[PDB]
């Protein structure tokens, strides 16, 4: 079926509230798109809201059932997700301010 939980949102600004409400925040590149999911390369899991797990896969996918995002090929994003890559927020990595860098402990 379709799930509101697989409708990622673009964030203009990453704030503490956004970080606290996800399980992981990651630095990713979108490497392509299958049917309904973006393909992802993971570069780093930030140590927020909690210290990052020791082990994490280099590849993953992000499902979008809505289309309220239009991610571009070979483009870098910060991706904040609850477990299973649901209720995600997305922000262009090249658009990070120093404030956001500090929140992410970049």
From TrEMBL:
- Supply the InterPro entries for this chain: AceES-2
Superkingdom, taxonomy of origin: Eukaryota
Task: Report the record's disulfide bonds.
Answer: 7-66, 81-88
Q: Name one Pfam family in it.
A: AceES-2
- The protein in question is named Excretory-secretory protein 2
**Which organism is the protein's source?**
Ancylostoma ceylanicum
């Amino acid at each position: 079926g379709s799930h509101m939980e697989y409708c990622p949102k673009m964030l203009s600004e990453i704030r503490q509230e956004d970080i606290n409400d996800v399980e992981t925040v990651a630095y990713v590149t979108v490497t392509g798109k299958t049917a309904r999911s973006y393909n992802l390369q993971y570069w780093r899991l930030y140590d927020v809201p909690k210290t990052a797990p020791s082990q994490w896969p280099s590849f993953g996918t992000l499902r979008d059932d809505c289309g309220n995002i239009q991610l571009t090929a070979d483009t870098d994003y910060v991706l904040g997700c609850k477990s299973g890559n649901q209720d995600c927020f997305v922000k262009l990595h090249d658009g990070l301010s120093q404030k956001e860098k500090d929140l992410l402990k970049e």
